[PDB]
């Protein structure tokens, strides 16, 4: 099969979860930390289908590679950021997750960016430009907006990918106790 960028389907929500749980995770959110994997799981493959979550499959393109999905990139109006988060509350959980309130409630972007949150890739797939692929195609999408991301201060290779497509420096944010750049283009 041919390798392909394209808009998710509801039915790569199951891969797409395995990839927000990973970010999750590195991120070390409290309930990621203390709610079991399986339970988690499926609250994010139905954050992607049942309801406009941040992680909506409208808000998601993915790269398929051999009938699988390899990797994805998350993006989004920031001025409907927090719109976006509150749709978490109209997912079917239990009530054990429901406790810990929505994943992300801090707000990340600005209202005049259209903010790229995630671009993951699975362990498998690296090495072979995929999030580089994602990120250019994402941006070639639509030349009349400010798109803006979050960068790990500690992670140096993705800040010159960022920089080398054209982000720059738009000052830093805390989320979650780590520090990220902030980046526009």
């Known amino acids: ?31 990621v930390k203390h709610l079991p994997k399986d339970m988690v799981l499926d609250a994010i493959e139905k954050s992607c289908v049942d309801a406009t979550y941040r992680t909506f499959y409208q808000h998601i393109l993915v790269y398929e590679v051999e009938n699988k999905v ?13 719109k976006y988060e ?8 239990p009530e ?3 406790q810990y309130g929505t994943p992300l409630p801090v707000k990340e972007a600005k209202d005049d960016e259209y903010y790229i949150e995630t671009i993951a890739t699975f362990a498998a797939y690296r090495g072979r430009g995929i999030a ?20 790990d201060i500690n992670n140096e290779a993705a800040l010159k990918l960022y920089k080398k497509v054209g982000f720059i420096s ?5 989320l979650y106790k780590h520090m990220y750049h902030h980046l526009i283009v």
């Not at 099969?1 to 959110?29: C, G, H, T």
């Not at 990797?71 to 001025?79: P, W």
């Open 1 to 31: 099969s041919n390798a392909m960028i394209r808009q998710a389907r509801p039915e790569d929500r199951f891969d797409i979860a395995k990839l927000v749980y990973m970010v999750w995770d590195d991120m070390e959110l409290e309930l």
């Open 70 to 82: 390899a990797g994805c990139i998350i993006s989004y109006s920031g001025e409907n950021e927090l």
């Open 86 to 93: 509150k749709a978490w509350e109209l997912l079917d959980l």
């Open 96 to 98: 054990e997750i429901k």
């Open 132 to 151: 580089t692929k994602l990120l250019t195609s994402l941006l070639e999408s639509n030349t009349h907006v400010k798109w803006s991301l979050n960068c």
């Open 170 to 174: 738009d000052g830093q944010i805390e």
